[PDB]
Amino acid sequence: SSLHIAMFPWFAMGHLIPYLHLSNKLAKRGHKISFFTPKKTQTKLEQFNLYPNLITFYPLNVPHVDGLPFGAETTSDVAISLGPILMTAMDQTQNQIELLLTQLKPQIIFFDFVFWLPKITQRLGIKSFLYFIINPATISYTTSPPRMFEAENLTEVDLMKPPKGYPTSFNLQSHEAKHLASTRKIEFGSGIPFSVRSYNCLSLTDAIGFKGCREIEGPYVDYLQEQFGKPVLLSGPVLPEQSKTALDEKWGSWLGGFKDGSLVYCALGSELKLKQDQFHELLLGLELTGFPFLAILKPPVGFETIEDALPEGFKERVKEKGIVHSGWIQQQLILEHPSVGCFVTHCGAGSITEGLVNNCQMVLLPQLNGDYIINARIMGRHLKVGVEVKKGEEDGLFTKESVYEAVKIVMDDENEIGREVRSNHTKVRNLLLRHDLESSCLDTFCEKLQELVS
Numbered sequence: 280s281s282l283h284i285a286m287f288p289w290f291a292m293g294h295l296i297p298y299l300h301l302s303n304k305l306a307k308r309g310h311k312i313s314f315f316t317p318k319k320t321q322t323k324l325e326q327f328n329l330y331p332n333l334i335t336f337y338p339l340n341v342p343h344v345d346g347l348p349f350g351a352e353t354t355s356d357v358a359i360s361l362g363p364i365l366m367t368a369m370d371q372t373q374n375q376i377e378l379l380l381t382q383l384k385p386q387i388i389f390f391d392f393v394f395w396l397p398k399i400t401q402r403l404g405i406k407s408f409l410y411f412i413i414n415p416a417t418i419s420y421t422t423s424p425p426r427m428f429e430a431e432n433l434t435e436v437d438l439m440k441p442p443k444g445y446p447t448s449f450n451l452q453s454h455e456a457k458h459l460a461s462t463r464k465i466e467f468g469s470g471i472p473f474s475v476r477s478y479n480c481l482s483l484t485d486a487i488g489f490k491g492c493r494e495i496e497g498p499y500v501d502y503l504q505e506q507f508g509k510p511v512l513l514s515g516p517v518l519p520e521q522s523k524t525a526l527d528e529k530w531g532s533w534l535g536g537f538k539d540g541s542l543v544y545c546a547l548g549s550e551l552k553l554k555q556d557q558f559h560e561l562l563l564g565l566e567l568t569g570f571p572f573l574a575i576l577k578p579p580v581g582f583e584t585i586e587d588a589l590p591e592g593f594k595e596r597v598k599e600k601g602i603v604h605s606g607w608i609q610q611q612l613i614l615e616h617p618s619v620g621c622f623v624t625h626c627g628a629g630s631i632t633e634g635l636v637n638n639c640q641m642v643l644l645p646q647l648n649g650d651y652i653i654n655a656r657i658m659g660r661h662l663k664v665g666v667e668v669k670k671g672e673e674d675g676l677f678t679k680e681s682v683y684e685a686v687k688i689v690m691d692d693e694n695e696i697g698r699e700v701r702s703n704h705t706k707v708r709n710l711l712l713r714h715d716l717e718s719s720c721l722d723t724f725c726e727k728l729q730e731l732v733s
């Protein structure tokens with residue numbers, strides 16, 4: 280029997296897009312989807328609704344919070360430092376969520392971040408489902424019960440080792456463990472420390488789910504089910520669905536001018552701005568390779584245009600071999616273009632999936648975020664599908680030479696490390712795209728959802 284599922288993702292394109300990819304897959308199986316989205320953002324999402332008779336968008340008015348820029352709805356609209364104010368705004372949609380649930384009466388609601396929701400759904404006889412599109416390895420590492428019980432006694436040294444029972448081994452750098460130790464405590468919406476918020480969600484929800492498959496995410500989902508004692512489901516890897524919009528002719532034309540697999544595509548998602556010095560090092564490092572390149576970057580902190588921030592003489596030198604562009608582009612369609620030989624990625628979970636299912640060599644440039652870093656270690660050290668750019672142990676900065684080196688290694692047909700990561704990427708791609716992998720993930724996913732509402 281088909282389920283009625285409401286979708287309430289965090290106000291970020293990296294959550295809205297995979298929630299919508301999964302919504303399409305569920306609607307293909309006959310499930311009805313009530314998709315809650317920020318009002319103005321809906322227009323940018325219609326692109327991905329492949330089943331409009333089963334997936335209905337319901338607009339939310341993102342309420343004012345002092346300090347929130349006017350009209351902002353998504354982390355793509357605000358600086359990263361304003362994230363916590365946008366969380367307060369999510370929290371403030373509770374009254375219009377409460378009334379949406381009372382009239383739509385879904386059986387289940389998928390959600391991010393809003394730990395006040397499972398109390399409302401329990402009142403309404405709705406099952407609450409905390410659905411993560413970040414890596415379960417990340418939540419396991421930072422937000423499992425052993426971490427939370429040390430409360431404010433958790434130090435950087437504590438975060439250099441995994442919590443008790445963690446299924447896997449990888450190494451963080453000092454500046455990374457410092458980042459996790461401090462940001463953990465910072466308020467993220469309505470006065471709630473960041474890790475406490477996610478821990479409240481994990482503790483109060485009826486069930487948990489993650490993007491992923493047993494073959495990769497399995498050990499972390501098993502750890503989390505053991506720790507929190509409730510079902511932790513896998514949706515499958517949320518393979519991107521095809522958009523209703525073809526590749527912009529202007530990019531298709533320009534990309535088509537380059538030899539197959541010769542171009543380096545670099546993008547760091549839609550939420551982040553580099554500091555100027557690392558903006559310069561990254562671009563000079565791309566230039567040093569001599570390969571054509573497309574870099575999708577916001578102007579660095581303090582700057583409003585790409586032009587103003589470019590290293591001196593850069594435009595005149597790179598000529599028509601390189602473009603630095605700050606607008607939103609069709610990343611999934613660009614990564615499929617045969618010109619792209621290399622993807623320099625900030626290791627956002629969505630970008631990771633989009634690179635893995637394509638042929639591009641992966642260069643890992645994780646930005647300062649627990650999920651990006653943990654994704655980069657898993658991809659670089661466990662799956663060994665990419666080469667990570669070296670950062671300073673204490674300062675977290677990279678040189679132009681380290682960018683150049685990583686791209687040169689993966690692009691060199693005769694380099695054994697490049698051949699190794701190509702071979703391992705092929706293995707992972709063949710797994711993720713296996714004819715029965717995503718479908719059997721979704722088979723199990725939907726049976727366990729049926730169990731949840733039983």
Ligand SMILES: O=c1c(O[C@@H]2O[C@H](CO)[C@@H](O)[C@H](O)[C@H]2O)c(-c2ccc(O)c(O)c2)oc2cc(O)cc(O)c12
Nearest residue numbers: 291354362390391392413417421422477480648649650
């Ligand atoms: O990145 C994390 C994360 O998602 C992101 O939180 C950033 C803010 O810090 C946002 O700006 C990005 O839009 C969001 O994708 C989340 C998160 C995502 C969805 C949830 O429903 C949830 O409860 C936690 O948790 C983390 C926990 C960590 O210990 C370390 C992390 O890096 C994250």
Ligand SMILES: O=c1ccn([C@@H]2O[C@H](COP(=O)(O)OP(=O)(O)O)[C@@H](O)[C@H]2O)c(=O)[nH]1
Nearest residue numbers: 293548549550607608610611627628629630
């Ligand atoms: O200019 C852009 C930037 C991002 N994306 C898409 O936005 C999502 C970004 O998710 P990810 O988790 O990689 O990074 P974030 O932007 O949240 O840091 C992915 O589906 C990308 O393909 C896009 O289409 N165009």
